[PDB]
Structure formats: structure tokens, C-alpha cells
Design a protein around this ligand. Structure first.
Ligand SMILES: [Zn+2]
Ligand SMILES: [Zn+2]
Ligand SMILES: [Zn+2]
Ligand SMILES: [Zn+2]
Ligand SMILES: [Zn+2]
Lengths: 329, 265, 263, 185, 109
């Protein structure tokens, strides 16, 4: 199944009054922001080439809290600042989606444009009908996958299914974590989706040539002090503090080899290991994965290496490591 | 309409950096400023959009020998019973009308990932295997064999700052702001100069603007070295050469692509 | 507390080459130095715990899950178990000429999941700061890059420090690996003096590493190359499916077979 | 009664808050206004504004209209539907039934109320297994006779635990039930 | 979907039927076999029409002399339009199953 490795995602947060209601254990808005910080960090950790943008909608107006960027810390700071937001007004799906569409219209065709609307207040007061905007969204192939809160909104249901996204409603906080963690992963590319080669640039960390001879002093490029060494660009030739980042001049993505390598496991998903409770002639008391005695009647095995893994080993392998230790051999 | 003049007045003092750089491009009289922009309550409003009757009444009763407080007062002011229901029906209808304006993947070569971009007889294995098998028939020699004082002292001397494996200035402050400002100017103009440079753009109207921008490169880099000269003749310390690399590399790209265009022709 | 894991690269081909050369350094002394390091690590504190793995071309095996000489019972048990198991593993081994490169990614994966198991079992009251003191001894294999990168990223997410201690060779992949997770990278040139390096550079834990002078990190060359002839490239043309660094613009990348549309 | 309740809510601030939360539409005897209001109500339901359609149980709109998925999601019944006890036609119709066929006047009156309520509350389950909740804001329905005369399919789903929920408890359980129905099969 | 009803075999266009549909069909067949007027209630606004129409058509095929024709009445014309749509779908399904046209006529006044 074709997957879009590079995706520009907009997490549309609503500053509606209904967010005031403390349906969850803490305030709803505070919980959403606290978990969305984790979502942002994990999304960047699972898709370095991708970038994210936050639009906060309240009082019938949508404001770009943070433009598209490759730095998780800046977005995290924006979330922490927004934690104290007043949270009064009414959202406008038309306004939020129009802002997202305006920013995403000029984005490259190859990248997957995606929107995740964390809908809280079921109402949607908009200057213009949103069914018309749905046509433009379908034309622009911008995937929109709403996540409703305490409501199965019909307009958002049709939005999601027509635009190709998925609709969900929060059963509880634990299920909210699961929903956002699921949305972290790249979505499969459908027929409407198209792939195209994208120019990429690989910089190399550089320092003073020899005892600060013919040095290359520079401060930064988006109170930066002088830097003896740092990253550079093949074309900008402008010092960059951290990678990966889009060029401020070229418009070309600067990214190192490990960042790309971080996404190969998506192309190579791990086949689920059959769960057999009984020992099944497994005379090895120690679990091969962790070399620990199997204290539970559960075993996992591959179709190639035919090794033995306990519950923790299998869960960790399929969750984070994304590869079978013994089966690597 | 003087929309450009209105926008310039709006951004004249609201945003300092934008106007600072736009003015800087003219301070030394580099180029014309045309290309700069060429290339790049609630209740009353709600009533205004809600009640067309109120809109007509406002148009006809625009303040004339009256007061806005009086106009506000005029707002709130079975026959009455049905009027309320009719009024809600009409008002909700008006609000709604105002809101209603008129692929499975397959691959042939997977080992390329197994050996990614990272770069790079028979009896020898047998000999090594047997020798290492016979190596460790004796164990636990830690008492003296593992380490010796002379080697330990050599290791400590190496770990010393002058030793092996251990190799071992913010004096200017005001110059920092000037360097930052110059870098911002370079970035601003390089943005437009590189906006369409990577793309071939084999069209007459597309190439005209790259030619104009290429000339603008000469014209801006004409004035950059004069400020460089002013800064240089202070102490001849802490050389600023990174700025030179950007200009020289832009010139190299310009000339190389000009030669390539001539070759293509 | 701290959970240390020593991933020793005991490659029979290379260590037996040393044995044939009759050099001063030997695998026996390397194992003794690693043993002393582990003993000192546990010596540091009771709560501290350690484990050992041996890396071989075929597979990797754990070397670790009275006072006859007046010795501490726990460290005596550690000495006996590691000595016996390492001798058994080295003595018994099949021969396969096709596969001779040392295996390290699988050993590191085993270490990572072992650390996860210990972190799950340990009480939540005490926080565990695990570490992996990888000790390479032979050149790495090109085909292992992908899996090794997977395990390195897993370690980064799980907050484990990969302290590399390569000797006799500088593995660019391993230095890249430890750089990502912030682990130290020391290249000891004096093998008979390896243990002094451990008791200074590696032995101190992450808690005290910041407040201590240690050798500066080595510059890491994050090179990129096209999949054709294997050479450094500064500009890569990747697609949206393969995510592969290529040579030059082509109508369709071979590893994709996609119907790229020109423009 | 609908007009009196609407007027009281208008005098108080409840009605304005309801208007803010969601659009409000009302029914009138005139068929033209009824049709226009319902036409706008459908568009409101399609859009995210939503709508609250106040109507009368005996109104021709109630019988003619059919509510489906994302239409009339939550059916609210304000008061047991009873015809005025002054219309003399029903007096003949009712006392004659008492005299012949032996039906108690109260029995037939409660039957006429329960049948009408079931008619006007049974629309949300039209078809295609579209979720929806029917809330009856009247303690009279909690009486055994009303429950017994209620249709079997609704009554069996109804339970004693939720029989006489307070307003707040009913709101909470409605929210939870909507959560459960939101997720797919 | 051919259902082996107790009385006979009855065709059905949709894939699956709930147990309440089985109960409805069996009770309706009992009433028709008794050839006596009766009353019954089914919750669903839709689905009852298709089940009733299918059972009546199958009973007509089995005992054409027993029932001359079906007179199905609905409250309003907009509603009876949906009924005629359901009947058209059922007839198309049955015609596809049989492979040919049969002397069956259905209309709305
Ligand atoms: Zn650049
Ligand atoms: Zn295990
Ligand atoms: Zn396996
Ligand atoms: Zn090439
Ligand atoms: Zn490809």
C-alpha cells in the first residue's frame, strides 16, 4: 500500500466555549493541549521530513498560532502559551478550513496535505456554506480527518468521508491517546494521491578548519550569538543551527541521512506474530527476546526466524523497535 | 486607487524590520522601489448583518441632529403572542440566510536499504578459529595481567589536556546587531533572486524576471562591499568572511547558468 | 539506579587473527577488562545492576542474566558465570565461510528489549537510567545499516545512551549511532591500557557525566550517496514512496516503478 | 401551550442561550410557514448550525414528516399529548365508547395520548440503524399505565434505572449514549 | 436470499434479516393461512414494507387462487412513493432470480 512519507499536517484546535466544560478529569482544553504536545513531539519523531502547523479558531475567527515549521520545540512553546488562552467564542469550520486551504494551496503536489480538526463544540457558525468548501477541498486533494469530542457531527462526518479522511468520537482520554497516536502514522496513498520526485539537500556538520584559521563565523538563520561551527547548505551557504529545516532562500529541504532512515520502518511494517498461549513444544524456559522465564501462558513467533518472544518482547517490538531482534540475524 | 500608498502607510511604522530593509534597499540608491512590492462594535455589526430592516433604517436615519445613544434606545422597542413566534422564525431564517451566501506497492530491489548510503584467505578463518579456541583455557588473570602502572600513567597523561585523545570569544557586542541586519538584508534579496533560479523556466516572460534579478544581484553586491570596507578598518580582527561566500557562490551560480544557457542556445 | 549493559563484540575471526599474530592484546584480557568494569559498576552501588552480551557472526548470547578467596559473593558469581559461558560460547561454534562479518544490530536489539523488560519489572518508586557500553572490535557490515538505524532510533526514543568504545577501527555507522543518542565515543589506541579508559570515560553515569571533563566528541560525517555507485552526494532526488537518495533526475526510480508524470 | 412556554422562555434568558447554542425554529398553523420553516430546518441539520424545531403533536407536520439519520436525532416530548377537555365532539366520541364496547373514559383518553406520543416519537428509528434517543420530559410517562400502553419495542429497551432520571442525569446519560453510538459497528 | 419459511420458500432482496423479521413473516403467514383478518405491529419504519411485500408475493405464487391481489394502503402519497420504490426493487430482484418476466402487475393510484 503506497504511503506518503512527506506530509504537511495542520492540527486545527477550536477555542470554543464548550472546551470550558470539564468532561475529562482536567479542563478539556488543557488536556487536549497537554496531549497534543506529546502528539506533536511524537509526530516529528516519527516523520522528520514532515512538518506541522496549528490553527486556533475561536469567536468565529481562525488565527494561525504557528506557521509550518520543522522545529518541534517552537510548536511546543506555542502549545504551552495557548494553555492560558481565554477559551471564549464560537468556532467556524469555514474560517479554519479556508485558512488551512490558503496556506496549503501553494504547497507542492508530491507532499500529502492533511488536516486534523479536533472538534469540541458541535456548532459551526460560518459566513458561507461549508458544502461548497467541500468541493474545493476535494479538488485540492487536502485530506481532512476530523476527531469529534462528545458529538457525532453530521457535517464533519460527510466532510471526512467525502474528502477521504476518517471520523471518530472520543470514548475517553485513553481512547483519545490511541486516536492521536494512530493519526501520527502516515496515511496510505489513495488513487487521487500522486507521487513525484522532490529535490533534497544533505548538509554536513562543519567546524573551524584548522585552529580557527579561515573560520566561518555566523550567528544563525531563524538572540543568536556567534557560532564557531554548525550546519550549512549546498546552495544557501547560510549557517543553520539545527536540522532538518527548509531553506530560507532555496526553498529546498535540508535533512540528514538518519532523518530519512527514520522513516524506512513505515515502508517495512512488521508482520504480526501469531499469539499461541500453550507452550507448543517450546522447551526454552527463557524468552529468547529478553532471556527471561515466561511467567505467562503466551508466546509469539515469526514465519521466518521461528523464534520465541514473550508478551513484553512482542509488544515492544511491534510498538517501538519495529523489527524482530533474532529475525534480523 | 492608491492601494500601494495605503499599504505603505500602514506598514511604515507598524513593522520595524520590513520597512527598515525596504528603506535600506534605497538608502544607497540601489534600485527602484517598484519591484520591491511588485515581486512580493460586535453587537452593531451583528445587527447590521442580521436585520435588513435595521440596515435600511440606518441608511435613512444616518446621524443627523440626533445621538447614537438615542439610536441604541430605539433598538429594543394573542396578537403579541403570535408576533413573538413569528419574530423568532424570521430572525433565525435571516441568520441562516446571512450564513448562506448567494495502490499496493511493489519493489524489485530491497537490499539497497539494507546497505543504504553509508559506504564500505579461507584457511585464515580456520587458523583464527582454532587459535582463539585454544586461547582461553586459562581464565581470571586479573591479579596483575589486566593492567600495569606504567600503562595506566601513560593513559592518564594522554587524557591530560595536552595528551592524546583529549585536545582540550564574545569580545564584540555592538557589531553583532549590524551583522544581523546585513544578514537579514542579504536574505531578503536572495529570497527573490533564488525564488525561480532552480527552476529552468524556459519561457520569455519567465526569464525576463530572472535576468532583471540577476542584474539586481550585481547592483546590490556593488554596495555590500562598501559597508564591508567600513567595518573592516576598525581592528582587523574577527574576520567576517561568511558573507563573502554567499555573494561569490551566487555569482558562480549566475555565471555558470549563463554559460549553460549559452551552450543550450 | 543504573542498569549497565556491556555489548562485547567478540568476533572469532578478528580475535583469532590477533591470536595468530601473537599480539600483546588478547580476547582473554578484553573479557577480563570488561569483567572488571562490570564489577566496578556494581561496586558503585547496591541498586546498580549490570548485564553482558557477546556479539558473534551467527548469533549473540547473554553472558549474565562462597568466599573461597575472601570475595564478595555476588561479584564471585558474576565472575564464574561470565567465565564459564564465554568459554563455552567460544569453544563451540559452527563454521560458515559465507557469513563472517560480526553481528551487532541483533545484539543491541536484545539489549534494548532486555532493558525494557527490566524497566517494566522494576518498581515505579525508583527511576532507572540504563546505558549500553558497546565495545566494537571488528569492521561493521554494510547490509546491517537499516536494522542498526532502527535500533538506534528506538534507543533514542526510549532514552538509553549508547557509549561506543570502538578499538582498532573507526566504524562510521557506530559513531553515527552514538551521536544520535548522545552517548560518548572513545577510540582507545592503546589496547593494553583499555581498562583505564573505562574507569574514566565510560564508567561515570549520565548523572555525573555533564559535571565532568571527558574527551570532546568526534566530528560526524553525515554523508549521503546515491543508490547507484555508492559515493558522497550533496543533493538527493528522493521520491514520495521509496524515500531513497538517488543519483540524478530519472523518468522513474527503479526501486519504485511508479508512473511519475513529467512537468 | 407551546406559545405560552415560548413566551416565558423569551421573558427569561433561557431562550437567548438556546438561540446562541443552536438555531431555533417554530411551527405555526399556516402550512406555507410550516413548509418554509421545515425546509430551512433541513438545511440547518445538514450544516453544523443545527436546529431545534418546536412543533405540536397534533400538527399535520408531525404526522407528515419522517425523521431519519441526522434528522431529528433527539426527539423531545414536552408533556403528555392530551386534547383539550372542552371540545364537545370528543365528548360524544368518548362517552359513546364508554356506553358501547365498554371502554373507560380515562382508559381511552390515555390510549389517545400514548398512541399519539408513540406516533410522534417513533420517527427517529426510521431505518438503516440510525442512532437516536427519545426523551420524554414528563413524569406522567413514568407511570406504569403509560409505560404499559407504550409500544413494546420502546418499553422493553426502557429500564427502571433510567425511568425517572433527573434533568442533569438524563443529560449525562444522553451524552454517554451518543458517545457509544458515534463509534462504528 | 431465499428464506425457507415454515409455510414455503420466500425470496428476499437484502442480504440479512433480523430475528424480528422472521417472527413477523411467520405470524403473517399464520394469519394468511387462517384467512382471517388480524392486526400486528412492527417497529421499523422501513424493512417492514419489503418483508410484507415479499411474503405476500411468495404466498400469491404458492396459492394464487387464495389471494386475488394485494391492496396496500399508506397514509400519504409522498410515503406511498417510497413503498412503490421498495416494490420496484423487489420485483427487479425477483425478475433477475427467475431470468424472465412474469405476469405480475403493480401500480399506485
Ligand atoms: Zn539553501
Ligand atoms: Zn521476552
Ligand atoms: Zn523473527
Ligand atoms: Zn549515481
Ligand atoms: Zn520510488
Amino acid at each position: 500500500v503506497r504511503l506518503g512519507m512527506m506530509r504537511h499536517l495542520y492540527v486545527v484546535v477550536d477555542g470554543s466555549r464548550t472546551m470550558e466544560d470539564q468532561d475529562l478529569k482536567p479542563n478539556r482544553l488543557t488536556c487536549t493541549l497537554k496531549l497534543l504536545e506529546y502528539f506533536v513531539e511524537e509526530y516529528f519523531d516519527q516523520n522528520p521530513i514532515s512538518q506541522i502547523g496549528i490553527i486556533v479558531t475561536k469567536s468565529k475567527r481562525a488565527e494561525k498560532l504557528t506557521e509550518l515549521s520543522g522545529n518541534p520545540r517552537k510548536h511546543i512553546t506555542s502549545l504551552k502559551k495557548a494553555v492560558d488562552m481565554t477559551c471564549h467564542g464560537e468556532p467556524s469550520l469555514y474560517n479554519s478550513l479556508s485558512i488551512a486551504m490558503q496556506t496549503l494551496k501553494h504547497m507542492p503536489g508530491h507532499t500529502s496535505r492533511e488536516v486534523l480538526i479536533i472538534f469540541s463544540s458541535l456548532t459551526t457558525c460560518d459566513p458561507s456554506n461549508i458544502y461548497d468548501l467541500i468541493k474545493t477541498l476535494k479538488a485540492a486533494k487536502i485530506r481532512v480527518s476530523v476527531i469529534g469530542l462528545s458529538a457525532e457531527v453530521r457535517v464533519c462526518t460527510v466532510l471526512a468521508r467525502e474528502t477521504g479522511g476518517t471520523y471518530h468520537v472520543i470514548l475517553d482520554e485513553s481512547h483519545y491517546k490511541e486516536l492521536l497516536t494512530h493519526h501520527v502514522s502516515p496515511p496510505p496513498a489513495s488513487s487521487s494521491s500522486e507521487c513525484s520526485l522532490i529535490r533534497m539537500g544533505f548538509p554536513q556538520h562543519t567546524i573551524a578548519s584548522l585552529s580557527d584559521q579561515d573560520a566561518k563565523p555566523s550567528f544563525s538563520m531563524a538572540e543568536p550569538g556567534l557560532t564557531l561551527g554548525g550546519y550549512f547548505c549546498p546552495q544557501c551557504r547560510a549557517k543553520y543551527c539545527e536540522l532538518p529545516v527548509e531553506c530560507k532562500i532555496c526553498g529546498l529541504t535540508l535533512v540528514s541521512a538518519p532523518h530519512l532512515a527514520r522513516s524506512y520502518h513505515h515502508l517495512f511494517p512488521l508482520d504480526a506474530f501469531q499469539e499461541i498461549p500453550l507452550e507448543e513444544y517450546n522447551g526454552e524456559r527463557f524468552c529468547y527476546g529478553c532471556q527471561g522465564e515466561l511467567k505467562d501462558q503466551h508466546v509469539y513467533v515469526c514465519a521466518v526466524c521461528q523464534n520465541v518472544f514473550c508478551v513484553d518482547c512482542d509488544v515492544f517490538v511491534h510498538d517501538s523497535l519495529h523489527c524482530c531482534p533474532g529475525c534480523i540475524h | 486607487a492608491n492601494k500601494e500608498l495605503e499599504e505603505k502607510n500602514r506598514m511604515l511604522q507598524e513593522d520595524p524590520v520590513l520597512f527598515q530593509l525596504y528603506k535600506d534597499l534605497v538608502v544607497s540608491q540601489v534600485i527602484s522601489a517598484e519591484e520591491f512590492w511588485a515581486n512580493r462594535s460586535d453587537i452593531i455589526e451583528s445587527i447590521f448583518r442580521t436585520y435588513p430592516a435595521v440596515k435600511m433604517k440606518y441608511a435613512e436615519n444616518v446621524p443627523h441632529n440626533m445621538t447614537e445613544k438615542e439610536f441604541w434606545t430605539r433598538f429594543f422597542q394573542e396578537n403579541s403572542n403570535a408576533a413573538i413566534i413569528k419574530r423568532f422564525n424570521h430572525h433565525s431564517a435571516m441568520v441562516l440566510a446571512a450564513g448562506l451566501r448567494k495502490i499496493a506497492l511493489n519493489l524489485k530491489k530491497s537490499d539497497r536499504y539494507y546497505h543504504g548510503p553509508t559506504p564500505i584467505t579461507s584457511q585464515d578463518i580456520i587458523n583464527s578459529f582454532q587459535s582463539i579456541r585454544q586461547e582461553m583455557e586459562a581464565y581470571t588473570p586479573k591479579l596483575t595481567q589486566v593492567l600495569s602502572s606504567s600503562a595506566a600513567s601513560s593513559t592518564i597523561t594522554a587524557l591530560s589536556p595536552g595528551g592524546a585523545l583529549m585536545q582540550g570569544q564574545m569580545v564584540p557586542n555592538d557589531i553583532q546587531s549590524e551583522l544581523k541586519h546585513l544578514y537579514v538584508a542579504v536574505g531578503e534579496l536572495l529570497r527573490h533572486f533564488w525564488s525561480c533560479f532552480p527552476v529552468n523556466t524556459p519561457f520569455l516572460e519567465e526569464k525576463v524576471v530572472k535576468m532583471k534579478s540577476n542584474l539586481e544581484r550585481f547592483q546590490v553586491t556593488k554596495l555590500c562591499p562598501f559597508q564591508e570596507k567600513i567595518r573592516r578598518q576598525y581592528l582587523s580582527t574577527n574576520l567576517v568572511s561568511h558573507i563573502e561566500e554567499m555573494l561569490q557562490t551566487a555569482y558562480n551560480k549566475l555565471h555558470t547558468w549563463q554559460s549553460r544557457r549559452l551552450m543550450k542556445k | 539506579l543504573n542498569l549497565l549493559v556491556i555489548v562485547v563484540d567478540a568476533n572469532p575471526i578478528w580475535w583469532g587473527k590477533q591470536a595468530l599474530k601473537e599480539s600483546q592484546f588478547t580476547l582473554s584480557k578484553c573479557i577480563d577488562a570488561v569483567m572488571v568494569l562490570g564489577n566496578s559498576h556494581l561496586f558503585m552501588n547496591r541498586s546498580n545492576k549490570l548485564a553482558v552480551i557477546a556479539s558473534h557472526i551467527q548469533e549473540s548470547r547473554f553472558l549474565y542474566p562462597g568466599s573461597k578467596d575472601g570475595k564478595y559473593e555476588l561479584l564471585t558469581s558474576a565472575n564464574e558465570v561470565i567465565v564459564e559461558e564465554i568459554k563455552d560460547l567460544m569453544t563451540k561454534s559452527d563454521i560458515k565461510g559465507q557469513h563472517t562479518e560480526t553481528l551487532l544490530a541483533g545484539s543491541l536489539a536484545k539489549a534494548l528489549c532486555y532493558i525494557h523488560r527490566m524497566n517494566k519489572e522494576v518498581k515505579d518508586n525508583q527511576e532507572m537510567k540504563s546505558r549500553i557500553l558497546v565495545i566494537k572490535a571488528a569492521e561493521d557490515s554494510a547490509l546491517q545499516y537499516m536494522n542498526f538505524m532502527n535500533v538506534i532510533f528506538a534507543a533514542q526514543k526510549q532514552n538509553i545512551l549508547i557509549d561506543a568504545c570502538v578499538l582498532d577501527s573507526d566504524s562510521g555507522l557506530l559513531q553515527q549511532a552514538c551521536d544520535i543518542t548522545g552517548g560518548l565515543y572513545l577510540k582507545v589506541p592503546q589496547m593494553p591500557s583499555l581498562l583505564q579508559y573505562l574507569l574514566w570515560v565510560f564508567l561515570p553515569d549520565q548523572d555525573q557525566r555533564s559535571q565532568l571533563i571527558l574527551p570532546p566528541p568526534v566530528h560526524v560525517d553525515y554523508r549521503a550517496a546515491c543508490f547507484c555507485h555508492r559515493n558522497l552526494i550533496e543533493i538527493g532526488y528522493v521520491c514520495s514512496v521509496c524515500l531513497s537518495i538517488f543519483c540524478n533526475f530519472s523518468p522513474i526510480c527503479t526501486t519504485c516503478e511508479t508512473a511519475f508524470k513529467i512537468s | 401551550y407551546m406559545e405560552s412556554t415560548v413566551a416565558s422562555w423569551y421573558e427569561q434568558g433561557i431562550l437567548e442561550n438556546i438561540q446562541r447554542n443552536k438555531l431555533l425554529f417554530i411551527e405555526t398553523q399556516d402550512g406555507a410557514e410550516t413548509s418554509v420553516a421545515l425546509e430551512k430546518y433541513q438545511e440547518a441539520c445538514e450544516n453544523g448550525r443545527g436546529a431545534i424545531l418546536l412543533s405540536v403533536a397534533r400538527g399535520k407536520v408531525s404526522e407528515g414528516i419522517d425523521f431519519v439519520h441526522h434528522y431529528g436525532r433527539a426527539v423531545i416530548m414536552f408533556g403528555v399529548p392530551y386534547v383539550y377537555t372542552q371540545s364537545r365532539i370528543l365528548k360524544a366520541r368518548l362517552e359513546y365508547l364508554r356506553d358501547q364496547f365498554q371502554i373507560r373514559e380515562n382508559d381511552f383518553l390515555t390510549f389517545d395520548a400514548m398512541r399519539h406520543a408513540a406516533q410522534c416519537v417513533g420517527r427517529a428509528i426510521r431505518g438503516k440503524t440510525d442512532y437516536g434517543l427519545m426523551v420524554f420530559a414528563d413524569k406522567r410517562f413514568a407511570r406504569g399505565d403509560k409505560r404499559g400502553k407504550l409500544p413494546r419495542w420502546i418499553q422493553e429497551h426502557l429500564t427502571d434505572a433510567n425511568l425517572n432520571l433527573t434533568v442533569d442525569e438524563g443529560v449525562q446519560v444522553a451524552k454517554y449514549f451518543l458517545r457509544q453510538m458515534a463509534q462504528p459497528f | 436470499m431465499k428464506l425457507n419459511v415454515d409455510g414455503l420458500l420466500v425470496y428476499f432482496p437484502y442480504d440479512y434479516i433480523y430475528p424480528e423479521q422472521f417472527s413477523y413473516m411467520r405470524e403473517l403467514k399464520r394469519t394468511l393461512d387462517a384467512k382471517g383478518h388480524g392486526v400486528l405491529e412492527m417497529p421499523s419504519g422501513t424493512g417492514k414494507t419489503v418483508s410484507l411485500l415479499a411474503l405476500i408475493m411468495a404466498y400469491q405464487r404458492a396459492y394464487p387462487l387464495e389471494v386475488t391481489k394485494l391492496i396496500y394502503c399508506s397514509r400519504t402519497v409522498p410515503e406511498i412513493e417510497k413503498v412503490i420504490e421498495e416494490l420496484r426493487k423487489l420485483l427487479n430482484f425477483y425478475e433477475k432470480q427467475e431470468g424472465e418476466k412474469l405476469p405480475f402487475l403493480g401500480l399506485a393510484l
